[PDB]
Amino acid sequence: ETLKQRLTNLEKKITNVTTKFEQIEKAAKRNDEVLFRLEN
Amino acid sequence: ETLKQRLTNLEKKITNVTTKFEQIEKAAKRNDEVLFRLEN
Amino acid sequence: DNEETLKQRLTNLEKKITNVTTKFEQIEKAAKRNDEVLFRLEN
């Protein structure tokens, strides 16, 4: 496993984690929008 | 050097995701507290 | 993959990113050091 095989692997892992994380971000953002409408 | 750029990009993404993770976690607790106050 | 928590996965990923970065730094520094010895022998 070259340094470069490790880098490539980590780039993939960060991409998978980010996609998953982005779904949480969208739901968090929707939650703020819902609260905003309930508050006002 | 493309290795340096790759490493820098990977560091930035993991830092961005971990700081956003903390922010969203705080915001969800804060939203719960407001939602509690809206009822009571 | 594993029944790790998101937090564990991210912590693990931070550590691997840190290890590979450190590894790259050590290799670069090692190369410099070899070059310093070669420089001293060549002037």
The number of folded domains in chain A is 1
DSSP string, B2-24: HHHHHHHHHHHHHHHHHHHHHHH
Give the whole-angstrom CA distance, residue B27 versus residue A29. 10
> Between A14, A24, A38, which is nearest B14 by CB?
A14
- C-alpha closest to that of A37 among C30, C35, C41, B38: B38
Calculate how close chain B gets to C34, using CA atoms only, in Å. 20
Give the whole-angstrom CA distance, residue A5 versus residue A15. 16
Residues 6+ apart with CB under 8 A from A31: B27, B28, B31
> Is-contact B24 A28, C-beta < 8 A?
yes
Q: How was this structure determined?
A: X-ray
Q: Name the packing angle between helices B2-39 and A3-39 (round to 10°).
A: 20
Give the whole-angstrom CA distance, residue A19 versus residue C2. 17
What CATH code is carried by the domain that includes residue C8?
A: 1.20.5.110
Instruction: Return the residue matching tokens 């971990």.
Output: B18
Residues in chain A closer than 8 A to C14 (CB atoms): none
Calculate how close chain B gets to A38, using CA atoms only, in Å. 9
- Resolution of this deposited model, Å: 2.2
Per-residue tokens: A24: 């949480």
